[PDB]
Design a protein around this ligand. Structure first.
Ligand SMILES: *C1=[C][C]=[C][C]=[C@]1(*)[C@](*)(O(*)*)C(*)(*)#N
Ligand SMILES: *O(*)[C@@](*)([C@]1(*)=[C][C]=[C][C]=[C]1)C(*)(*)(*)(*)#N
Ligand SMILES: O=Cc1ccccc1
Ligand SMILES: O=Cc1ccccc1
Lengths: 258, 259
């Protein structure tokens, strides 16, 4: 009996813990423990995104999850898409609780530029927003940029390799959210002693039509990882299009940090 | 090419439109149109159940769905569990917009007794609620009873024939809700001219551990339906445990109500 791990899963913006519904039982059937976090104003969280003005407030459920682990427990901390920013923020707080960070089709921030850097780059490059709806909301500390995916955009750019039932599920659960670009432009840089110090790996899907493979090299060039894993045939929503293969990669990761 | 229909699907308490994620594409593939209503304080609706103090506010998204339909359109209205109550309520308002009511694993109220009658009767005899959490919320109508399912109760009594992924989904998404039994016990009886006038059928799952098949016979004995369909092996959450069979029943229904 090889030693099992505690995986903490962190969803993407505009989604919630539900995205993990296929992966969670897989990992649990192998003996691992799983905590799928629901971030603020996400999923069935009762707050609107407008009430959650900062990335720290957005991430607080994940900080609380880690704070509540018993003394000396460490987890494998998986961040998906914007979830990469969330787990970098957590790692800067609780580095000794994290065995390894798994950046899954994720923004991988560095300790040199402002925290928004990798998001601002993608936003300059990306062309295919489609029917996504962009809006603002003024807060007492400045404009907060909001977004709500449109269904055609979802289909073409996030869910194109998923079963149709998954796409219908997503249409009934996705919500307006934010990438907190303003807030993250004003935040202190991520630290070397906290986030920098934690082991990290990247897991990319070969057919991610939102986080392209050149943009990943660019992020990794800019901030190195231990190892890159590739999921052959995954769309951006890889826990839905290729859950078994994702399990396989996570299981490999767990073996390299036994 | 036979004429296809517009199905309006209404979820159960403590759930949401998401429950229909498997059945929706089956119906759409077959050429039908599908609206899966998200009721108040349900699924991703932004209000807590404490803000939804009556069954009429609970049901308002469905009423609004029917109100918005173009002139002369009629729908196959499907109500699941507590969704039977909701579709009865809607048929008392827009009876001419409904081709047929489909009571799926559902409460089938009558026009003789108070609207809560059939729930009160199950509540009398109901098994064990397991790890379900009950709370009371005070309102300008008096006390509202709230319930939040427990995960053991879910697994045993609602989801026992569902794939484990679907029980995990539901753990991620279920919410505190209400059966509105106080509000329903005070409300005007459903009318014969409205609700009573609409065509109705029943579809039951043979392994429903919440709505047992004797109680269903009792409801149908007390308020007749045109046809009864059974889904062999379905648990309560039949749209997740046997979506294809459910689609087969709805398809048979639709064959009976093309004009
Ligand atoms: C409804 C009615 C009686 C017991 C349990 C429920 C539950 O909310 C469902 N479906
Ligand atoms: O909301 C999407 C997204 C798209 C572009 C950039 C960041 C996030 C996801 N996940
Ligand atoms: O805020 C509007 C916008 C539009 C296209 C790309 C990025 C932002
Ligand atoms: O509706 C409240 C209640 C409480 C205990 C048992 C059964 C029902």
């Amino acid at each position: 009996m090889e030693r099992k791990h505690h995986f903490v899963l962190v969803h993407n913006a505009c989604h919630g813990a539900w995205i993990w519904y296929k992966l969670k039982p897989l990992l649990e059937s192998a003996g691992h423990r799983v905590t799928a976090v629901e971030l603020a104003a996400s999923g069935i969280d009762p707050r609107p995104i407008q009430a959650v003005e900062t990335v720290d407030e957005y991430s607080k459920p994940l900080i609380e999850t880690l704070k509540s682990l018993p003394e000396n427990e460490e987890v494998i901390l998986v961040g998906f898409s914007f979830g990469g920013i969330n787990i970098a923020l957590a790692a800067d707080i609780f580095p000794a609780k994290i065995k390894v960070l798994v950046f899954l089709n994720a923004f991988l921030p560095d300790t040199t530029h402002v925290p928004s850097h990798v998001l601002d780059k993608l936003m300059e490059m990306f062309g295919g927003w489609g029917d996504t709806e962009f809006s603002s909301h003024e807060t007492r500390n400045g404009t907060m940029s909001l977004l709500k995916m449109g269904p055609k955009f979802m289909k073409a750019r996030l869910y194109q390799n998923c079963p149709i039932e998954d796409y219908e599920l997503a249409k009934m659960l996705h919500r307006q959210g934010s990438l907190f670009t303003e807030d993250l432009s004003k935040k202190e840089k991520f630290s070397e002693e906290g986030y920098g110090s934690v082991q990290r790996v990247y897991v990319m899907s070969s057919e991610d039509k939102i986080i392209p493979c050149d943009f990943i090299r660019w992020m990794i060039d800019n901030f190195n990882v231990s190892k890159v894993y590739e999921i052959d045939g995954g769309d951006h929503m890889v826990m839905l299009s290729k859950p078994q293969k994702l399990f396989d990669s996570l299981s490999a990761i767990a073996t390299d940090y036994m």
